[PDB]
Design a protein around this ligand. Structure first.
Ligand SMILES: *[C@@H]1O[C@H](CO)[C@@H](O[C@@H]2O[C@H](CO)[C@@H](O)[C@H](O)[C@H]2NC(C)=O)[C@H](O)[C@H]1NC(C)=O
Ligand SMILES: *[C@@H]1O[C@H](CO)[C@@H](O[C@@H]2O[C@H](CO)[C@@H](O)[C@H](O)[C@H]2NC(C)=O)[C@H](O)[C@H]1NC(C)=O
Ligand SMILES: *[C@@H]1O[C@H](CO)[C@@H](O[C@@H]2O[C@H](CO)[C@@H](O)[C@H](O)[C@H]2NC(C)=O)[C@H](O)[C@H]1NC(C)=O
Ligand SMILES: *[C@@H]1O[C@H](CO)[C@@H](O)[C@H](O)[C@H]1NC(C)=O
Ligand SMILES: *[C@@H]1O[C@H](CO)[C@@H](O)[C@H](O)[C@H]1NC(C)=O
Ligand SMILES: *[C@@H]1O[C@H](CO)[C@@H](O)[C@H](O)[C@H]1NC(C)=O
Ligand SMILES: *[C@@H]1O[C@H](CO)[C@@H](O)[C@H](O)[C@H]1NC(C)=O
Ligand SMILES: *[C@@H]1O[C@H](CO)[C@@H](O)[C@H](O)[C@H]1NC(C)=O
Lengths: 272, 360, 48
């Protein structure tokens, strides 16, 4: 079966700016109390990140993919579950599935068929607040496929509406010469939901050696049956695109990145 | 020899740069891991024939070969790409495994570019074939006392098929151009014929269990290749090491620095490798180059005498035999006796130390 | 079939420049030694 939703709202692409974000470890090397300069794919500073509201209210079209992407979201009760990756995503080309369960997350690389509104909705049960998922309607079975993997999940707290959103998930996805590299960080905030100031470094997580051409992708989020049929809580996320640039990075004494500067922003930056 | 002359005058000279010689070499790499479960295929209940031989995809694991290879449990063996002895050193993106049981009397037709009943209709290989073919004598179990006719093989085929293009449909083969009517008729043949394997069979008639291991190259990153070994680490010696594919020579010492659990390599401002994490056990080691420095010869003019002295620069001369003594800040000088007396300089060495010729 | 020409398909390893081999003793593909002239991995070092 292929169930589709009727109660959702469409909003224009909201524009925001990060002011400091998009810095990750470029490789696996230890450097201490030094200044390094490197050229690689980074999110440009002060860019126009696109903001999508998912609050009942869904906003998840298919977005273009090129030279990886930066995806950042804050949300409690874990309504987001994963993504898909491919070029046509219709039962005829190699496809990739990422889906984060409360159990071990699973990674799949197979042919797949998809519904118009595929998702992993959890039916709300009065017996248990963290009730088991009910309608995970994305595919039944396409055919023989290529790659399967299982790993530990990334976060927790299936339920909760605490005042301070301790869930800030930042991810960067790249695909280079047959390797799919994921950089991830999970940091808490106790302030307004907008993009924070400051600085943080995204430690590397994993690289998957498959080798495919990826040009489009789409996010996957669950949905509750709490009221009025299909109604969810509040969630949102931000999408940004990478570009090739040269950065200057400052490795501290302990070996951890503490500051960075973009050498294509303004004359003071490049003379630095 | 260096000065290209048969006379030498008073004064120090420099020549014959010195460097310590290493002893041995070592390799250190992660533990064995997800080895491929091909044994259960080899130790399965039902094995395949040549019409529908088991074709399987193998990836994302290490395939142990040497233990199975050098084990006497095989009969014949033929790698078409390279020497099997180093099979573990070639890594494959994906492995096509073709396992089957046939009659050995046609095994010569297994090889590419061969003609025969099994090499023309069902089982084919390209001229540029690479994979290794392994066969084992298996008359003990495959053979049936009453005749194992469950096995079948493509006796006939109208037109030869491309390699690895198995056909499992068993449409009634038309030997002649006359139309075939009914399930069986004139010039109508069953393409599949039943094998006969019995203990009373002789050489060649005994069933052979054969695996052909082809693989794909470089379209995706290589994943499947044999396990690799390692040797116990040693310290305080100028040795050769291959750590995570980085080959170097130096002396390994413990370190007080602490890496992040994700970085492996330590570098300096000069951008050279000096700290490495061991792959087996989680620890951090510093690398120090073993000593090196040019040699100096101190001598009066050859007109006067022939005695000389040798100065090793920047070397603690407790390390001279591995190539009267006296150490100064510039290195260690041998061949000369130092005195408590003081004079004016005649031949300078450095750090205030000068040498000369004097009485005996 | 002019199978009169052979070629050394089996050898321990590669060789130096400008040397030739005449010995045709039984090959040792496996680490287990091959006593006699027949058994497992007891191949002739030539092919036709
Ligand atoms: C799953 O198996 C099918 C059947 O073998 C594969 O489809 C065949 O692929 C070969 C190789 O290109 C073609 O020659 C055949 O024409 C295909 N069959 C059909 C009916 O189209 C398929 O490729 C396999 N899937 C994967 C992911 O390997
Ligand atoms: C960087 O490492 C140093 C030590 O290598 C850390 O210094 C220690 O910090 C703890 C807690 O602040 C103290 O209890 C120790 O006495 C300190 N030891 C030394 C030798 O300084 C330092 O904290 C690390 N950096 C950060 C940000 O934690
Ligand atoms: C398939 O089964 C055979 C029968 O047991 C295995 O042969 C034994 O393997 C174990 C493994 O260490 C050895 O200790 C025994 O000595 C082997 N038997 C004999 C008679 O030597 C064989 O190993 C199995 N296949 C695989 C891939 O493990
Ligand atoms: C970025 O967004 C701001 C605010 O909407 C807009 O004024 C500016 O023109 C945008 N810059 C682009 C799209 O390059
Ligand atoms: C992969 O996708 C690209 C982008 O559309 C296209 O050239 C083709 O479908 C594939 N190319 C290669 C080299 O695999
Ligand atoms: C040694 O020196 C003396 C005077 O300086 C000179 O007369 C003599 O020829 C020299 N001998 C040689 C072998 O150079
Ligand atoms: C030489 O080594 C010895 C022992 O290792 C040490 O006592 C001495 O100070 C060293 N001298 C120099 C110049 O390094
Ligand atoms: C130099 O004098 C000191 C102090 O009198 C003495 O200990 C040392 O042995 C003397 N060395 C020589 C070479 O005479």
């Amino acid at each position: 079966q292929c169930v589709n939703l009727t109660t959702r709202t469409q909003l224009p692409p909201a524009y925001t700016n990060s002011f400091t974000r998009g810095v990750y470890y470029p490789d696996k090397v230890f450097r201490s109390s030094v200044l390094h300069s490197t050229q690689d794919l980074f999110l440009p500073f002060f860019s126009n990140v696109t903001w999508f509201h998912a609050i009942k209210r869904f906003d998840n079209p298919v977005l273009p993919f090129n030279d990886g992407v930066y995806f950042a979201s804050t949300e409690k009760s874990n309504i987001i579950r994963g993504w898909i990756f491919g070029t046509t995503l219709d039962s005829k080309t190699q496809s990739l599935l990422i889906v984060n369960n409360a159990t071990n997350v699973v990674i799949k690389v197979c042919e797949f068929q998809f519904c118009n509104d595929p998702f992993l909705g959890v039916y709300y049960h009065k017996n248990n607040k963290s009730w088991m998922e009910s309608e995970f309607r994305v595919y039944s079975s396409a055919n023989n496929c290529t790659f399967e993997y299982v790993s530990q999940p990334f976060l927790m707290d299936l339920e909760g509406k605490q005042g301070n959103f301790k869930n800030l998930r930042e991810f960067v996805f790249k695909n280079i010469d047959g390797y799919f590299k994921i950089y991830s960080k999970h940091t808490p905030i106790n302030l307004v939901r907008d993009l924070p100031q400051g600085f943080s470094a995204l430690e590397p997580l994993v690289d998957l050696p498959i080798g495919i051409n990826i040009t489009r992708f789409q996010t996957l989020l669950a949905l509750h049956n709490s009221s009025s049929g299909w109604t969810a809580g509040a969630a949102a996320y931000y999408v940004g695109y990478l570009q090739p640039r040269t950065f200057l990075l400052k490795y501290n004494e302990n070996g951890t990145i503490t500051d960075a500067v973009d050498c294509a922003l303004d004359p003071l930056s490049e003379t630095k | 020899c260096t000065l290209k002359s048969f006379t030498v005058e008073k004064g120090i000279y420099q020549t014959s740069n010195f460097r310590v010689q290493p002893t041995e070499s070592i390799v250190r790499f992660p533990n064995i891991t997800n080895l491929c479960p091909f044994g259960e295929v080899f130790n399965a209940t039902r094995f395949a024939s040549v019409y529908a031989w088991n074709r399987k995809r193998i990836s994302n694991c290490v395939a142990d070969y040497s233990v199975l290879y050098n084990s006497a449990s095989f009969s014949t063996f033929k790698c078409y790409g390279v020497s099997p002895t180093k099979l573990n050193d070639l890594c494959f993106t994906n492995v096509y495994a073709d396992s089957f049981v046939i009659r050995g009397d046609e095994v010569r037709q297994i090889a590419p570019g061969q003609t025969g009943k099994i090499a023309d209709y069902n089982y084919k290989l390209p001229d540029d074939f690479t994979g290794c073919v392994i066969a084992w004598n298996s008359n003990n179990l495959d053979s049936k006392v009453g005749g194992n006719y469950n096995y079948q093989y493509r006796l006939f085929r109208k037109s030869n098929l491309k390699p690895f293009e198995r056909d499992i449909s068993t449409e009634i083969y038309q030997a002649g151009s006359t139309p075939c009517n009914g399930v069986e008729g004139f010039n109508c043949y069953s393409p599949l014929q039943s094998y006969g394997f019995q203990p009373t069979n002789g050489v060649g008639y005994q069933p052979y269990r054969v695996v052909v291991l082809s693989f794909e190259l470089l379209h995706a990153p290589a994943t499947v290749c044999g396990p690799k070994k390692s040797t116990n680490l040693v310290k305080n010696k100028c040795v050769n090491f291959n750590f995570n594919g980085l080959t170097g020579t130096g002396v390994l010492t413990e370190s007080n620095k602490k890496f992040l659990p994700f970085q492996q390599f330590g570098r300096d401002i000069a951008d050279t490798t000096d700290a490495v994490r061991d792959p087996q056990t989680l620890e951090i080691l510093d690398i120090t180059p073993c000593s090196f420095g040019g040699v100096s010869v101190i001598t009066p003019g050859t007109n006067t005498s022939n005695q000389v002295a040798v100065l090793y620069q920047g070397v603690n001369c407790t390390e001279v035999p591995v190539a009267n003594v006296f150490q100064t800040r510039a290195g260690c000088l041998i061949g000369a006796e130092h005195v408590n007396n003081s004079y004016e300089c005649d031949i300078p060495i450095g750090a205030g130390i000068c040498a000369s010729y004097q009485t005996s």
